[PDB]
Design a protein around this ligand. Structure first.
Ligand SMILES: Nc1ncnc2c1ncn2[C@@H]1O[C@H](COP(=O)(O)OP(=O)(O)OP(O)(O)=S)[C@@H](O)[C@H]1O
Ligand SMILES: Nc1ncnc2c1ncn2[C@@H]1O[C@H](COP(=O)(O)OP(=O)(O)OP(O)(O)=S)[C@@H](O)[C@H]1O
Ligand SMILES: *N[C@@H](CCCNC(N)=[NH2+])C(=O)O
Ligand SMILES: *N[C@@H](CCCNC(N)=[NH2+])C(=O)O
Ligand SMILES: [Mg+2]
Ligand SMILES: [Mg+2]
Lengths: 4, 877
């Protein structure tokens, strides 16, 4: 998650 | 040492320009007011032992260790306090190089200015510096444990208020392109640009990224179905939830090898890569089923080849990187046991969320994986060939990326752009498994494994085995296609006595053009024709409301000196900066005590004008005209006197000036004169009787003309702008009720008092005036107000504002009475014998003024609040  | 006030500045300010992030503290030197370092026993040694890094401070000597010599010769403690604050927040990794210290008007208080990179960290360093210096003067040294605690707190503050690498890179690119950026307070969203030209990003997703595309990308099976329906070569797979379905699924996929993965996963929990028989498939299925949050498991054919990550921005392939898993090569006749820690001793490798190259974590799972390798710890690689430690091919494990942007086949680029468009993502990270990215995905058996929304491009800006790619540049190109920033025209109006009227006139004139104007004045903040917020609204906290509104096309901001002093300007630059006048009326507030200081403070607006902008200055005011230099961009002069030598010289070489020549508001474009109005058809001038309103009209007309507004629009706006209660709350609001007239105004200083008198004295009727002033002003100002009211009026009613700002009740009233008494005693004969009386209530004052108004008289009201007078005169018809 968050910047995959 | 006692800290009295701690203010932070976020834009251009009094202390510096281009140094937006500053913190200023009012430091009280109760006992060390004149106590030099050379006179303090053991101060220098303790200070230089607590922080040896101060030797790097190139102070006013300008040489290495110059600040140490300054301490040697004896220096005031404020200087060393600012230096220790700079060094304290510098040791935490935060480079800052600005500091100032000045003596205030009061005897014991200093003003110390510290540059900061983080607001919280800067304030913490400022608070800690005085404690450190007090401890040093009291005990001769500072404990090392407290120092380490303070630096750890500073590092924690820096880490807490820090953007991630993706957002940081995007913000750096936006700053490099001159695009304004602000941090929204909701969801770590960054807003680029102003008004209708604004854009938003969170980390990588923009405000134009679709919900449908992101949700589809998050769905693995839906994405596979959509891509297969479009002819994209996705892997052949099937879903399974029960043990019995496994054999049928394996028959469907086409044999062996296969892949078992969960539907929903993070960091690849419970995903096997290559299994070739029954039992391992069974345990992999069990592991994936217990790893998935919904018990369901994907089974698909295994495709051989390297794992590539392709970044597509705005439908174009920006960067291609091949993800090589963690590996070591024994080309130096050395085995795994040495290289595992040989690579770990390389400075490139690092942990956290900043360094992509992570140390090779030799986990028990990694031990099992290298067990499946077929070799051991000390088994030397053959011929010096790659031997891997894992198979996930991820940077978190300790793998490497290889740039392949220049080697991707054009057919692959077309296919990946189509994939990104089909899913519906402006920025997408596509994972491709193929034997060779330089060949079409049809020749080799390449497949599209997954599509990622909000991808991390950290691996593309530092491949470590190829050329870095400017992903942030591509994102900014997508957000702002051409050579366009997100700026809207900003018109900042500053001055002492005419900010509100000029702001409203500018807003009206621009409203004549088909544009939505968002403007903030003293009365309130307006967007278009509707009020957006009430209150004072003359600082950056109200300018942010206008600049962040998605419908505002032009921003006109009244920039009072209070906002500039408190937190500086709310914007980096303005298209037009207007300085109307600088009169020394409300001195003593803050550190401003001289009219030169006030002029320097008001010059922030003029100096903030962009090189392509304009600075509208009053040529008739020597201090305002003195700001002609040190201003980037063109200068435009307005003067009520058409024979101003400076204005004429400026027009001879260039132009762009405005004058009031022969009953005309005219624009000088060099040798050409462009007349707007007769100045008697302008309602606010009241047939040209008020000269200050004519000056305001001149400034507004020049400001709009400098931006290319047509002469007809300026003419219509000037003709249709009214000075009554419908538009102006209390700015030259004249009310007629037959017997007499009432003139409610906003005059509170000697300059506006003189301007008001210059129009009131022409009235042929009786002059009744209710005057007053804010309680935070100097006594001489009250005396001047009293004497001016005596000069201009015939009946005097002195009232003191209910909100006295800390002044004792009444004092201002009796001092205005002293001023009027002095003016009365200064007259020999009965030239002007105006009667005076003082009552301290607003309602009583206005009631008395309206009660005894004779036929054809004029009653002038200067209340604390305009709404009070408006309601009182509305009730009495
Ligand atoms: N069918 C497949 N054939 C070959 N390699 C595959 C296959 N499926 C996955 N892989 C590889 O395994 C990696 C992880 O697959 P993913 O579909 O990303 O599983 P995941 O659960 O999404 O793990 P993350 O969090 O996305 S890295 C891919 O990047 C490929 O290198
Ligand atoms: N150019 C001018 N020179 C002198 N006095 C002026 C000028 N323009 C307006 N005034 C007078 O000053 C009064 C107050 O100024 P305004 O323009 O109404 O508001 P303001 O300038 O924003 O004052 P502040 O800073 O908000 S308290 C007006 O009611 C006029 O009587
Ligand atoms: N890679 C990431 C995509 C989620 C999109 N971002 C937000 N905030 N919904 C993921 O967690 O899969
Ligand atoms: N991946 C993304 C995450 C940072 C934004 N989220 C939070 N909580 N700051 C990035 O910017 O790298
Ligand atoms: Mg994924
Ligand atoms: Mg105002």
């Amino acid at each position: 998650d968050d910047d995959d | 040492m006692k800290i009295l006030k701690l203010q932070t500045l976020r834009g251009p300010n009094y202390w510096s320009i281009h140094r937006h992030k500053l913190v200023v503290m009012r430091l009280d030197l109760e006992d060390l007011y004149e106590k030099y370092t050379s006179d303090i026993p053991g101060f220098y040694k303790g200070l230089t032992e607590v922080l040896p890094s101060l030797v790097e401070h190139l102070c006013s000597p300008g040489v290495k260790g110059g600040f140490l010599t300054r301490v040697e010769k004896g220096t005031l403690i404020g200087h060393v306090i600012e230096h220790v604050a700079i060094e304290l927040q510098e040791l935490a990794g935060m480079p800052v190089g600005f500091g100032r210290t000045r003596e205030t008007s009061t005897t014991g208080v200093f003003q110390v200015v510290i540059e900061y990179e983080n607001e919280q960290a800067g304030r913490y360093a400022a608070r800690a510096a005085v404690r450190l210096c007090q401890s040093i003067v009291d005990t001769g040294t500072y404990p090392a444990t407290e120092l380490q605690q303070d630096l750890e707190d500073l590092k924690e503050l820096k880490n807490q208020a820090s953007l991630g690498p993706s957002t940081e890179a995007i913000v750096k690119e936006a700053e490099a392109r001159g695009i304004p950026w602000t941090q929204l307070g909701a969801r770590f969203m960054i807003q680029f640009g102003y008004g209708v030209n604004q854009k938003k990003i969170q980390a990588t997703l923009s405000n134009q990224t679709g919900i449908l595309g992101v949700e589809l990308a998050c769905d693995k099976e839906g994405t596979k179905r959509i891509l297969k329906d479009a002819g994209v070569p996705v892997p052949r797979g099937t879903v399974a939830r029960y043990f019995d379905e496994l054999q049928d699924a394996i028959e469907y996929v086409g044999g062996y090898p296969i892949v078992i993965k969960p539907l929903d996963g993070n960091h690849g929990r419970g995903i096997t890569i290559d299994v070739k028989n029954w039992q391992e498939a069974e345990e992999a299925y069990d592991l994936a089923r217990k790893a998935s949050k919904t018990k369901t498991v994907i089974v698909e054919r295994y495709y051989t080849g390297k794992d590539h990550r392709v970044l597509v921005v705005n439908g174009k392939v920006v960067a291609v990187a091949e993800r090589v898993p963690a590996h070591v090569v024994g080309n130096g006749k050395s085995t795994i046991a040495e290289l595992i820690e040989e690579t770990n001793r390389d400075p490139q490798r690092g942990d956290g969320h900043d360094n992509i190259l992570t140390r090779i974590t030799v986990d028990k799972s990694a031990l099992d994986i290298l067990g499946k390798q077929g070799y051991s710890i000390d088994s030397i690689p053959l011929k010096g060939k790659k031997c891997f430690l894992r198979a996930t091919a991820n940077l978190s494990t300790g793998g490497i990326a290889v740039d392949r942007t220049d080697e991707i086949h054009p057919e692959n680029v077309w296919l990946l752009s189509r994939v990104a468009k089909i899913i519906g993502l402006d920025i997408a990270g596509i994972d491709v498994v193929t034997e060779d990215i330089s060949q079409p995905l049809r020749e080799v058996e390449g497949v599209i494994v997954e599509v990622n929304a909000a991808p991390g491009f950290r691996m593309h800006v530092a491949p470590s085995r190829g050329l870095a790619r400017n992903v942030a540049g591509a994102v900014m190109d997508m957000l702002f296609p051409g050579s366009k920033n997100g700026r809207i025209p900003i018109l900042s109006v500053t001055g002492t006595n005419g900010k509100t009227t000029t702001t409203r006139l500018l807003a009206h004139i621009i409203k004549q053009t088909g544009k939505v104007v968002g403007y903030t004045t003293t009365d309130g903040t307006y967007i278009g024709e509707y009020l957006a917020e009430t209150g004072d609204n003359t600082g950056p906290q109200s300018a942010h409301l206008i600049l962040s509104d998605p419908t505002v096309e032009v921003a006109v901001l009244e920039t009072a000196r209070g906002g500039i002093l408190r937190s500086g300007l709310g914007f980096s630059s303005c298209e037009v900066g207007i300085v109307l006048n600088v009169t020394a009326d409300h001195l003593g507030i803050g550190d401003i005590d001289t009219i030169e200081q006030l002029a320097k403070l008001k010059s922030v607006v003029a100096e903030s004008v962009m090189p392509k902008g304009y600075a509208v200055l009053n040529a008739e005011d020597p201090l305002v005209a003195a700001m002609a230099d040190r201003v980037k961009g063109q200068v435009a002069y307005f003067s009520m006197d058409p024979n101003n030598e400076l204005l004429l010289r400026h027009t001879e070489a260039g132009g762009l000036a405005a004058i009031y020549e022969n009953g005309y508001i005219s624009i000088l474009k060099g040798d050409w004169t462009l007349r707007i109005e007769k100045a008697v058809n302008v309602p606010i001038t009241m047939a040209g009787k008020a000269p200050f309103m004519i000056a305001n009209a001149l400034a507004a007309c020049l400001a709009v003309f400098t931006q290319g507004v047509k002469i007809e629009h300026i003419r219509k706006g000037l003709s249709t702008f009214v000075a009554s209660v419908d538009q102006t709350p209390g700015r030259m609001n004249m009310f007629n009720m037959g017997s007499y007239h009432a003139l409610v105004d906003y005059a509170h200083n000697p300059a506006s008092y003189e301007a008001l008198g210059g129009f009131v004295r022409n009235w042929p009727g009786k002059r009744i005036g209710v005057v007053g002033g804010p309680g935070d002003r100097r006594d001489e100002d009250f005396v001047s107000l009293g004497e001016l009211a005596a000069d201009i009026f015939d009946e005097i009613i002195i009232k003191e504002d209910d909100d006295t700002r800390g002044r004792p009740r009444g004092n201002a009233a009796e001092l205005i009475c002293q001023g009027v008494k002095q003016f009365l005693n200064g007259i020999k004969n009965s030239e002007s014998k105006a009667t005076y009386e003082s009552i301290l209530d607003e309602t009583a004052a206005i009631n008395t003024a309206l009660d005894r108004a004779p036929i054809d008289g004029l009653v002038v009201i200067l209340p604390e609040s305009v709404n009070r007078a408006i309601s009182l005169i509305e009730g009495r018809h």
